[PDB]
Nucleic acid binder design. Structure first.
Ligand SMILES: [Mg+2]
Ligand SMILES: [Mg+2]
Ligand SMILES: [Mg+2]
Ligand SMILES: [Mg+2]
Ligand SMILES: [Mg+2]
Ligand SMILES: [Mg+2]
Ligand SMILES: [Mg+2]
Ligand SMILES: [Mg+2]
Ligand SMILES: [Mg+2]
Ligand SMILES: [Mg+2]
Ligand SMILES: [Mg+2]
Ligand SMILES: [Mg+2]
Ligand SMILES: [Mg+2]
Ligand SMILES: [Mg+2]
Ligand SMILES: [Mg+2]
Ligand SMILES: [Mg+2]
Ligand SMILES: [Mg+2]
Ligand SMILES: [Mg+2]
Ligand SMILES: [Mg+2]
Ligand SMILES: [Mg+2]
Ligand SMILES: [Mg+2]
Ligand SMILES: [Mg+2]
Ligand SMILES: [Mg+2]
Lengths: 170, 244, 137, 57, 178
RNA sequence: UCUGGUUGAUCCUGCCAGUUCAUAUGCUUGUCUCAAAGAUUAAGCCAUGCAUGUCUAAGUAUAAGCAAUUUAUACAGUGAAACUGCGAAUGGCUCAUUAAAUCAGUUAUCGUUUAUUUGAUAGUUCCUUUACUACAUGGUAUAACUGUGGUAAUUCUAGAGCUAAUACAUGCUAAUCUCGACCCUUUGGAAGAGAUGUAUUUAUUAGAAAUGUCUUCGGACUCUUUGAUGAUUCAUAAUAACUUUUCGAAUCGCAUGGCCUUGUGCUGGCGAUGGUUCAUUCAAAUUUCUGCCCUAUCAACUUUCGAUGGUAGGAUAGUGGCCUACCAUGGUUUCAACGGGUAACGGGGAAUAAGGGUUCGAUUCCGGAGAGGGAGCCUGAGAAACGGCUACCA
RNA sequence: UUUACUUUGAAAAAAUUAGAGUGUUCAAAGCAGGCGGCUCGAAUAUAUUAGCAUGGAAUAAUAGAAUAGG
């Protein structure tokens, strides 16, 4: 039912174009994958060629990167806190790229304690906001992957100007 | 169409094959291979229309299934295999070695070569790039990938490939004063020396070529194939030496 | 610069909050080629424009056209007018014709209606935009 | 040819449906399941109007 | 911007190549000499003067036997419009530069080509353009006619046996209405 | 277009009379060569038959098949059926729709997919339950076949019993390379310090006055260390993790060579089919610029239900209002937008003409689109397929 | 200075058209190779516009820190 053809649209001048041909398979679209937090449910999609896409129908864990520290840990996703495209996705807790989520801080806190031996000092110093979040127990992260395309819900922990901007928006 | 085509009308076939228009309704559609469809000579045309060893397609298949034909030293059994420019076709039973080179008319010539000259071919460098694990390679005009090339080899240069090993023996840089062969356009088949390469960034480069008779012509860089130094080609040339 | 719901940034350009070598945020830029000078306002600006030929993820390749700006009323894109003479052979005479080309203009470029702009072809930016301003005059 | 008379319009009603949709959208300025499923005259009345008026006169 | 500064590099290239073997000299000089002639295509008058002096210097270093190869390459690259007049001004400059180095009979090999340039630029189409009032240009090469000077240099070197080469075009011109 | 009249005889303006192609049709029709076959704007409806299948030595035969044989001891010749693989997306036909659409020439993919062909390309030694299949794992399994059956009827099939694989699903087996003390001074030995695949997703990183001394007169002494494009966040490499996560040969024919410590030991030839990535080829999808017949008694159109653009997301093979959310109010137009007509598929071409022009082009080649009319899909590298499937209308 | 305009060169499939050779018995056609090196043979051409490269002195638009000021 979904097609991406540009013939069904009006011309730049505003003219109503007539049907040139019937819909082609090479200009199709598919139903959106409204990924939601829960036990992992992923189903494969057969795409053009022998290629395959992974549809994340449900996912509750993801690989999130602390870029300042240059690490990545697998962490549970608590929930979606802010989405720039549509607030209904926040309301329904739908996971997509660029959705601001809250993740468990435990693996990152444990790595930090092991690596720096603190709960050397100069390097162990981090941003005040991130440390406050660690005290809270949850970290704000931005999803960088596309769950409906790759099946992954990876992302990175917000820092610096981006963190300040999203704290203002929240 | 809903997929790749498999037939070729005779009137739609390349003109340089010289196919009778009333012989049939279809022409041998070249199969996928080293050379492009419009720039290739399928083995059926070469064996039947040019050499006349076979009287029809069935005899060509009979010859090929006996494993009598080698193309660049490897036995080929496909009737529509796309032989092309600078390919070496070997028939041991008849003691024949041929190299496919256009004549001044622009048609592939029946050019017989010796075994020593049949031991190698020339390839225009179409691409130079690093592959996986940081291994450089060169892609030639016949689709050959050759790894660990000399660092001096660049695009538009010509590499001499040993057919037994498929390795680079020598190479010629693209420079003024070099001997070049025209492989496209209305000047297809002519031989000359480079005088100047006109450069247009974001567009097609132009090369000026002067023949032994001092006549000058301009051609796109894609259609130019360096074959040696002036007066010293690295391959034997057909009758006419690409004049006129 | 941050007048949108999403945080505007150059993708994969990372400013490390720990090191703090320089006050200015790290900024990526390129030269579009074909002898077109990257303006210094692009190098030392602060705007974010994914469709900019000098700081965005867009490449200039294909036809290079010239035109007169006729509209600048919509955001980061303009409409230029290209005029030509079409030859009618029966009457052995010409007729004036024109076409309007919508072009994306980077915020590194300042343009008024009436100035002559050279534009370079890039990939489809929107429904109707396939060009990008590369030089103003 | 868009709305030319056809030999048998009943046989192509679906085609006729598209044309009406195309007409309304084109002329709008002047006016201003899932099959692949497991389970599925004028002169006369004027004369009378004149006549009845003529009587009432 | 720096093209004029790099032109003498060609003179350096000729010298280092001249030290190489007799197979290498035939392999590298045509690449060097032809490239210099291409720069004469340039529309910049100042650049063209830079090429001429470099060609003049190379001409002294090389011999008169090489003059045929240089002239033949010049004729190929200059063929249309101002280029024909560029060819005339350049060939005279090379001959003027090589005045001392040239020996008797040296120009016999290139005698046929020079007279063609001389006559085409006095009585041919090129000569008419130089004499045309309608032709308005600041290119010095076209305002100046050096064919007369080229004739004096040529006749000095030509052996008397080949002097019929100069007289033959004169006779043909005299035959036609003048 | 010319010719003859209209006067007693001329000129000019008028009048009168005569002066190939297409369709339909009439009569005649012996010989040679060659060649075509539309038409009710009815792209209206179709009885019957056929037009797409396919096996090499080389995927799978205990057919209760045939024929053989030194009369068979796993099989072995040939081989129906059936599984498996590939093809059926080519070809052929028609011109309904379609007026910046198709198409023609000319561009781009630094914007994407690509079966097949052709060329390259993958020793990861080790890492506790070694309580160990690799001299080789399972039914987590079935067809053909045997047998019991339903229906008036179809290339309808049910229940039960069997049995294979290149089907399906699992899963393994003393290496190479940097330095190198010490001896020895080369054809060197090596105590020892070290290093170790791909595929997917994300984040980060890289990708820029030695003019001396000695020497045997050679040479040695310190240093270098990515490439390409007009142009890139390119090629490529590195780090940290991630994955319902891949791949890294449990395959087949022909033949029986070489070492021995004489073992059905070790090793070994020529081919077939596969397999990861890259390149190539056959393609596909989008795409830049210019160019269409009649209509102004069609002057404003598009935008509520996407029209023009911005940000983000989704979807896609991928760009993109392609779709969604939030934003602005844009975009086309007397240089004719928009609307209408078209007995409008476009072109190469055909006819006529002295030249300019006018007309025709369903029709041998190229491109597009369709398969009674709309809509949606499975499989596959490739189809919105129709001699494939499902619904609605006739 | 730039543009228009004009010259030249690539490009614009084949078939079709013009043209060259050839006793299909002639012709309509089809067709490229002959003798034992012979200097033997389609030599070929053709396309208004748009894009690409190139030579131009006129013509027609377009420009100037032009002959400026103290
Ligand atoms: Mg078809
Ligand atoms: Mg050409
Ligand atoms: Mg390019
Ligand atoms: Mg008879
Ligand atoms: Mg048997
Ligand atoms: Mg058998
Ligand atoms: Mg219309
Ligand atoms: Mg168009
Ligand atoms: Mg196949
Ligand atoms: Mg392969
Ligand atoms: Mg059973
Ligand atoms: Mg987007
Ligand atoms: Mg919307
Ligand atoms: Mg028509
Ligand atoms: Mg029609
Ligand atoms: Mg047609
Ligand atoms: Mg179709
Ligand atoms: Mg029908
Ligand atoms: Mg298939
Ligand atoms: Mg269908
Ligand atoms: Mg049918
Ligand atoms: Mg079909
Ligand atoms: Mg043109």
């Amino acid at each position: 039912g979904i097609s991406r053809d540009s013939r069904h649209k009006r011309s730049a001048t505003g003219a109503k174009r007539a049907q040139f041909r019937k819909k082609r398979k090479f200009e199709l679209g598919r139903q959106p994958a409204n990924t939601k937090i829960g036990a992992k449910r992923i189903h494969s999609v057969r795409t053009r060629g022998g290629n395959k896409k992974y549809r994340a129908l449900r996912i509750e864990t993801g690989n999130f990167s602390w870029a300042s520290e240059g690490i990545s840990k697998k962490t549970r996703i608590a929930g979606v806190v802010y989405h720039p495209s549509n607030n209904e996705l926040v309301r329904t807790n739908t996971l997509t790229k660029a959705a601001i989520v809250q993740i468990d801080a435990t693996p990152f806190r444990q790595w930090f304690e092991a690596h720096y031996g603190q709960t050397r000092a100069a390097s162990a110093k981090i941003e005040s906001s991130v440390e406050s979040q660690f005290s809270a127990g949850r970290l704000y992260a931005c999803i960088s992957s596309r769950p409906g395309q790759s099946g992954r819900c990876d992302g990175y922990i917000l820092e610096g100007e981006e963190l300040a901007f999203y704290l203002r928006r929240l | 169409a809903r997929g790749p085509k498999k037939h070729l009308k005779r009137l739609a076939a390349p003109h340089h094959w010289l196919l009778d228009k009333l012989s049939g309704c279809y022409a041998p559609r070249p199969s996928a291979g080293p050379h492009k469809l419009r720039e290739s000579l399928p083995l059926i045309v070469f064996l039947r229309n040019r050499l006349k060893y076979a009287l029809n397609g069935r005899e060509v298949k009979a010859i090929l299934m006996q494993r009598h034909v080698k193309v660049d030293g490897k036995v080929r059994t496909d009737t529509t295999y796309p032989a092309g420019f600078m390919d070496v076709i070997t028939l041991d039973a008849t003691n024949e070695n041929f190299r496919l080179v256009y004549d001044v008319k622009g048609r592939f010539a029946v050019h017989r070569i010796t075994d020593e000259e049949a031991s190698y071919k020339l390839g225009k460098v179409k691409k130079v790039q690093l592959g996986k694990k940081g291994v450089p390679y060169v892609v030639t005009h016949d689709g050959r990938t050759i790894r660990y090339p000399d660092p001096n080899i660049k695009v538009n240069d010509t590499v001499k490939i040993d057919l037994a090993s498929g390795k680079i023996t020598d190479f010629i840089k693209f420079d003024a004063g070099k001997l070049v062969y025209v492989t496209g356009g209305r000047n297809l088949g002519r031989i000359g020396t480079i005088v100047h390469k006109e450069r247009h960034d974001g567009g097609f480069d132009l090369v000026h070529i002067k023949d032994s008779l001092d006549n000058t012509f301009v051609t796109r860089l894609n259609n130019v194939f360096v074959i040696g130094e002036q007066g010293k080609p690295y391959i034997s040339l057909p009758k006419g030496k690409g004049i006129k | 610069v941050q007048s949108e719901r999403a945080f505007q940034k150059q993708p994969h350009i990372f400013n490390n909050p720990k090191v703090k070598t320089s006050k200015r945020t790290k900024r990526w830029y390129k030269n579009a080629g074909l002898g077109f000078k990257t303006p210094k306002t692009a190098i030392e600006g602060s705007y974010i424009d994914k469709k900019c030929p000098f700081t965005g993820l867009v490449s200039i390749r294909g036809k290079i056209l010239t035109g007169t700006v006729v509209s600048t009323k919509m955001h980061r894109t303009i409409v230029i007018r290209r005029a030509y003479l079409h030859y009618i052979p029966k009457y052995n005479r010409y007729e004036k014709r024109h076409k309007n080309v919508p072009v994306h203009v980077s915020p590194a470029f300042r343009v008024q209606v009436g100035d002559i702009v050279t534009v370079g072809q890039c990939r489809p930016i929107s429904k109707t935009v396939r060009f990008n301003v590369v030089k103003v005059s | 040819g868009t709305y030319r008379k056809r030999f048998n319009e009943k046989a192509r009603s679906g085609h006729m449906a598209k044309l009406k949709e195309l007409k309304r959208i084109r002329n709008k300025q002047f006016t201003r399941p899932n099959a692949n499923a497991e389970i599925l005259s004028r002169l006369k009345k004027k004369r009378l109007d004149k006549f009845i008026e003529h009587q009432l006169k | 911007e720096t093209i004029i500064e790099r032109m003498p590099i060609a003179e350096a290239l000729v010298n280092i190549v001249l030290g190489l073997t007799n197979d290498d000299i035939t392999n590298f000089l045509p690449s060097i000499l032809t490239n210099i002639c291409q720069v004469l295509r340039s529309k910049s008058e100042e650049l063209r003067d830079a090429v001429r002096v470099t060609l003049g210097k190379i001409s002294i270093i090389l011999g008169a036997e090489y003059l045929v190869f240089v002239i033949k390459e010049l004729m190929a690259t200059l063929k249309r419009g101002s280029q024909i007049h560029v060819l005339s001004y350049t060939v005279h400059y090379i001959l003027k530069s090589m005045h001392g180095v040239l020996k008797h009979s040296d120009l016999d090999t290139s005698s046929s080509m020079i007279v063609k340039i001389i006559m085409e630029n006095i009585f041919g189409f090129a000569g008419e353009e130089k004499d045309s009032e309608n032709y308005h240009t600041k290119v010095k090469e076209i305002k100046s006619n050096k064919s007369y000077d080229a004739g004096e240099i040529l006749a000095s070197n030509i052996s008397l046996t080949e002097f019929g080469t100069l007289l033959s075009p004169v006779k043909a011109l005299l035959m036609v209405r003048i």
